[PDB]
Design a protein around this nucleic acid. Structure first.
Ligand SMILES: [Zn+2]
Ligand SMILES: [Zn+2]
Ligand SMILES: [Zn+2]
Ligand SMILES: [Zn+2]
Lengths: 196, 56, 89, 129, 61, 226, 37, 157
RNA sequence: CCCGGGUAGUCCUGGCUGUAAAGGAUGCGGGCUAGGUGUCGGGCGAGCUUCGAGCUCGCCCGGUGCCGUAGGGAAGCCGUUAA
RNA sequence: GAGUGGUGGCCACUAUUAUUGGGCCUAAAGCGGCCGUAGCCGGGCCCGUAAGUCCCUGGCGAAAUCCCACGGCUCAACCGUGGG
């Protein structure tokens, strides 16, 4: 049925969004609360997570690049890259990484994942310039411009980001066949979380 | 003579040096989805011809 | 209201001093031992008139257009500038 | 105020095609608009179109296929004979036989190619290429 | 915006409280609607939807 | 096959640095048409040197404009050279570039390199009323382009009629492989950079016109190599 | 007087208000000389 | 937009697409005509008659009913009044505009310095002249009919 | 230019003059072309309430601002209040 | 090249006269603002007339001049016979 139970999803607070809205994310928005806050759809989040896992299982694991400027997402992308073999960039993204061959850390991935389209604007711009598929963790106020695969989630909460990246890594491993089943994943969820 | 790629959403041809993209369908894995620069900027949804899966 | 005035049968280049045209024309005059530039310009005008007639008749429909097309082809073949099996193209 | 429903429809179609829309609504509708849409559908520039009743002049729902570079009405509606079509083709089209000049003729609304085939003239009302 | 505008107002089959007479009234009246039998008021006109002062038996189209 | 020998030399004595260069080196891409319409970025001139070696020919390289720009400082005037150049084989492919330098030779070299990086692919044919043939001697249909204040409209012309355009347009179209054309220009054509970029934009925009399958046969449309 | 806002710019010319005043004085003087008052 | 203010207000009626009267209408054509006649005798205009019919009697519109005496026409308040010999002598909108122009002139002769109200009066007279032109063309007014403020007082009275 | 005084004028009534950087330096009517975010008026729905013509949130229409996509322009910039 | 310079005039250049086909925020240029007369431009459907419009067919719009084919002055300019 669902990859993760409703209680765990709500505890991580994936459905919690931002007071602002967007016509692009109107299709993912569930409802608006009495205080003006918008709630996402956990069912659509789960479906898009399954789709993203299946999509990312096909790429070569060294050619996937996951980026997160946001501090709450810096640790989850590092853990996801360690688990799945993909390259991870937390913190500041050096301009010219994907467009300047003279840069010492020059690298051209086959697929990009961004924790936040607004925060990781430089990485998205360079990915657009080089012409590669883009997967974006999108919130209620985000725009789906230049986003080839959108995952509706709370891309600001620490627990939400950790759970989303843990689910994505587990699904990628399952679909790639490294783990024979979902239950074979023996990495705790708290490992992805950033420690305060 | 060689085949010229055609956008999946709008059905127009792809110019030589535009910021277009192409990828295997995330759902079925059989068909290939092409998106032109204008469709990518405007976030126009696309449907896979095989599964019928819709959206970016 | 003016009577007819006889006109020149050749045309003068739009610019008298262009390097590429000057070299091409000089090569032609040296090759064919012509006496003056207006001789080459007369031959060029004849060629341009043939081309203009062909272009005008290509996009024309009618019995007179057909007659003119056949007459142009016959005249060119008689002059010997085209093979006996040539077409309007 | 509203003066040219056909020109409004063609401008709306052109704008939607440029912005990448797949479906358009034409309002108000008219039989001339229906004939023009029939000609474009026959020549393959638009997909399916349907008439909807709303207690008014009506609405036309049209599906676009991304095959139109430019569609526009011709005003004033110049009368044209059989032998005068070449200059209008040069005026309104990029190359010979590229687009279609929609002409209202005494035998109905048809493209300039069919008008030439039938050997009749008319009034230029639109152009699509 | 919609390609076929449709009214937001409805007609109401309403029973008068005082005498029980059944009537059909508009939900957005510009006048003071009164019962045809006893004259008691039924709907209060306002700037928008009226205030119904009698039992609404049914909402028609 | 001197250009083939040059291409082979560029192939062996070269270490690729980008994904497209790696594809060319390992032979995944073998034709020039395969590096277009895919969103790839071109940052290595060796890719063009291998796939389309004719661009290095002296007759295939053209220097369009040389300008002397001046910047004011405390000491005096600092002189820079801006060179606008174009390259490409005279069949299907053309490219334009601008290079800045302290010396004219450096500026020319940089402009040639940037033109090779900016090479594009066009479409040719015949759409004139007075020709109606099916040879790729002209533009298949009327096209438009603009850069700055210059607007250029290219119209198909009959075979045997020279390029009726300014000198810069003549050079660009000759490098692109077009032989006959009519032109209509508006704006300041004396601005060489803007005029050249408008002509280049029109040649690129020839790819933006939607066509039917029968139009290819009607106009003899040839994409890239003929 | 007709409006010429191009003349209000002060680059290499005196104020248009005072030019207008001088022109009006000249016109009145000419009318007085001609006797039209 | 508006005729003079050039504003783009869009408030108005939104009638659903209909071809036949609704089935829940209790009254018939004869009773509807009798009610229209009774309201006209009471002294309401056509707009007020229609509003009362919609509000109190629950009749969505008289125009939904086919004319019994003319198969090519639908029913109408003015048509019912004219077949019962109760139609207004001059069009109601023209009468209303003339009435309020006369009232405004009466106010302005006591307040000569109200230039804004004077402009409003000028706009009202322009509307009156537009309507007079239209009705002269359509033959609803005599060809010699003209609008004059002095003679408009008798028409208002 | 600064300071101390000061006539016409600035104020009311009946008139004349018809001029301003009278500027949004942008004539007016109609159709279409991503959004996001304040505020004013009206309407609708929901939740609070001291039951207020009160407060909060969402939607529709009409005004009034800023940022901005496609696109436009020589550029400054305009961008459903289009340039 | 037996011609080649100089001056005045007309067209192109010039989309600097813009129907095709120009502009008016900051460069020349939106009346200070509204009402409105002639003119110009005008919502959807049904029937009737062919004035505009399109097609066909008779009488015309002299010749010379313009284009094409052939024929005669050596070819040509020129002239004649036919088609336009
Ligand atoms: Zn597309
Ligand atoms: Zn699929
Ligand atoms: Zn009662
Ligand atoms: Zn040709």
């Amino acid at each position: 049925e669902y990859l993760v139970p409703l209680d765990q999803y709500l505890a991580a607070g994936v459905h919690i969004g931002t007071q602002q809205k967007t016509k692009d994310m109107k299709k993912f928005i569930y409802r608006v609360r009495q205080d003006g806050l918008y709630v996402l759809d956990v069912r659509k989040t789960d479906e898009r997570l399954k789709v993203a896992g299946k999509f990312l299982a096909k790429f070569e694991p060294q050619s996937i690049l996951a980026v997160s400027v946001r501090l709450y997402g810096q640790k989850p992308v590092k853990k996801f890259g360690e688990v799945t073999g993909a390259r991870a960039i937390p913190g500041r993204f050096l301009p010219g990484t994907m467009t300047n061959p003279a840069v010492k850390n020059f690298f051209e991935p086959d697929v990009l994942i961004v924790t936040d389209p607004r925060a990781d604007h430089q990485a998205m711009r360079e990915a657009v310039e080089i012409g590669i598929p883009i997967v974006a963790l999108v919130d209620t106020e985000n725009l789906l411009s230049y986003v080839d695969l959108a995952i509706p989630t709370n891309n600001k909460g620490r627990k939400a980001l950790a759970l989303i990246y843990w689910i994505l890594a587990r699904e990628i491993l399952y679909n790639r066949g490294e783990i024979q089943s979902r239950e074979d994943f023996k990495i705790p969820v708290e490992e992805f979380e950033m420690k305060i | 003579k060689f085949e010229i790629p055609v956008c999946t959403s709008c059905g127009r041809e792809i110019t030589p040096r535009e910021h277009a993209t192409h990828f295997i369908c995330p759902n079925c894995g059989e068909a290939v989805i092409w998106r032109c620069e204008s469709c990518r900027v405007l976030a126009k949804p696309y449907k896979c011809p095989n599964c019928g899966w819709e959206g970016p | 209201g003016d009577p007819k005035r006889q006109r020149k049968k050749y045309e003068t280049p739009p610019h008298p001093w262009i390097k590429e045209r000057l070299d091409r024309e000089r090569v032609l005059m040296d090759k064919y031992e012509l006496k003056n530039k207006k001789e080459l310009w007369k031959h060029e005008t004849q060629l341009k008139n043939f081309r203009r007639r062909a272009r005008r008749l290509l996009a024309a429909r009618g019995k007179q257009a057909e007659i003119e097309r056949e007459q142009l082809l016959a005249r060119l073949k008689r002059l010997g500038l085209l093979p006996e099996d040539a077409v309007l193209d | 105020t509203l003066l040219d429903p056909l020109a409004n429809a063609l401008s709306h179609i052109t704008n939607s095609e440029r912005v990448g829309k797949r479906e358009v609504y034409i309002k108000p509708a008219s039989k001339l608009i229906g004939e023009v849409l029939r000609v474009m559908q026959k020549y393959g520039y638009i997909g399916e179109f349907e008439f909807i009743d709303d207690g008014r002049a009506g609405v036309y729902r049209v599906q676009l296929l991304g095959r139109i570079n430019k569609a526009g009405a011709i005003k004033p509606r110049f009368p044209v004979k059989v032998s005068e079509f070449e200059k209008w083709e040069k005026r309104f089209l990029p190359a010979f036989e590229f687009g279609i000049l929609i002409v209202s003729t005494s035998q109905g609304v048809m493209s300039h190619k069919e008008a030439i085939e039938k050997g009749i003239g008319g009034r230029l009302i639109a152009y699509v290429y | 915006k919609p390609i076929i505008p449709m009214p937001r107002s409805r007609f109401l089959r309403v029973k008068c409280i005082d005498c029980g007479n059944e009537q059909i009234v508009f939900s957005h009246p510009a006048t003071k609607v009164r019962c045809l039998i006893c004259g008691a008021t039924l709907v209060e006109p306002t700037g928008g939807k009226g205030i119904v002062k009698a039992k609404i038996l049914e909402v028609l189209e | 096959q001197e250009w083939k020998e040059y291409a082979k030399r560029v192939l062996d004595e070269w270490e690729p640095k980008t994904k497209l260069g790696m594809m060319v080196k390992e032979g995944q891409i073998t034709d020039i048409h395969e590096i277009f319409r895919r969103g790839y970025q071109i940052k290595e001139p060796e890719i063009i040197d291998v796939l389309l070696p004719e661009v290095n020919a002296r007759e295939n390289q053209e220097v369009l404009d040389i300008a002397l720009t001046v910047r004011m400082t405390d000491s005096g005037r600092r002189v820079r050279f801006r060179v606008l150049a174009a390259v490409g084989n005279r069949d299907g492919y053309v490219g334009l570039g601008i290079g800045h330098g302290k010396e004219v030779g450096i500026a020319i070299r940089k402009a040639i390199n940037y033109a090779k990086l900016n090479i594009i692919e066009i479409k040719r044919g015949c759409g004139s009323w007075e020709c109606r043939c099916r040879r790729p001697h002209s533009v298949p249909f009327a096209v438009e382009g603009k850069e700055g204040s210059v607007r250029v409209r290219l119209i198909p012309g009959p075979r045997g009629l020279g390029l009726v355009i300014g000198d810069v347009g003549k050079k660009i179209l000759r490098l692109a492989g077009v032989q006959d054309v009519w032109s209509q220009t508006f704006g300041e054509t004396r601005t060489t950079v803007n005029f050249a970029k408008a002509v280049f934009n029109a040649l690129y925009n020839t790819n933006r016109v939607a066509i039917s399958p029968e139009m290819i046969e009607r106009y003899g449309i040839v994409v890239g190599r003929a | 007087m007709k409006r010429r806002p191009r003349k209000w710019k002060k680059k290499g010319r005196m104020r248009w208000k005072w030019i207008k005043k001088r022109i009006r004085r000249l016109k009145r003087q000419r009318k007085k000389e001609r006797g039209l008052i | 937009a508006r005729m003079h203010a050039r504003k783009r207000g869009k408030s108005g009626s939104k009638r659903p697409p209909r071809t036949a009267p609704p089935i829940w209408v209790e009254y018939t054509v004869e009773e509807i005509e009798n009610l229209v006649v009774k309201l006209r005798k009471e002294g309401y205009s056509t707009a007020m008659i229609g509003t009362i019919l919609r509000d109190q009697y629950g009749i969505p519109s008289v125009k939904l009913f086919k004319d019994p005496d003319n198969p090519n026409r639908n029913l109408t308040i003015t048509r019912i009044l004219e077949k019962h010999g109760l139609a207004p002598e001059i069009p109601e909108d023209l009468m209303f505009l003339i009435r309020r122009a006369v009232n405004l002139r009466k106010h302005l002769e006591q307040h000569p310095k109200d230039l804004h109200s004077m402009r409003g009066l000028q706009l009202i007279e322009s509307k009156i002249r537009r309507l007079v032109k239209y009705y002269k063309r359509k033959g609803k007014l005599p060809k010699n009919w003209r609008y004059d403020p002095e003679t408009a007082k008798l028409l208002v009275r």
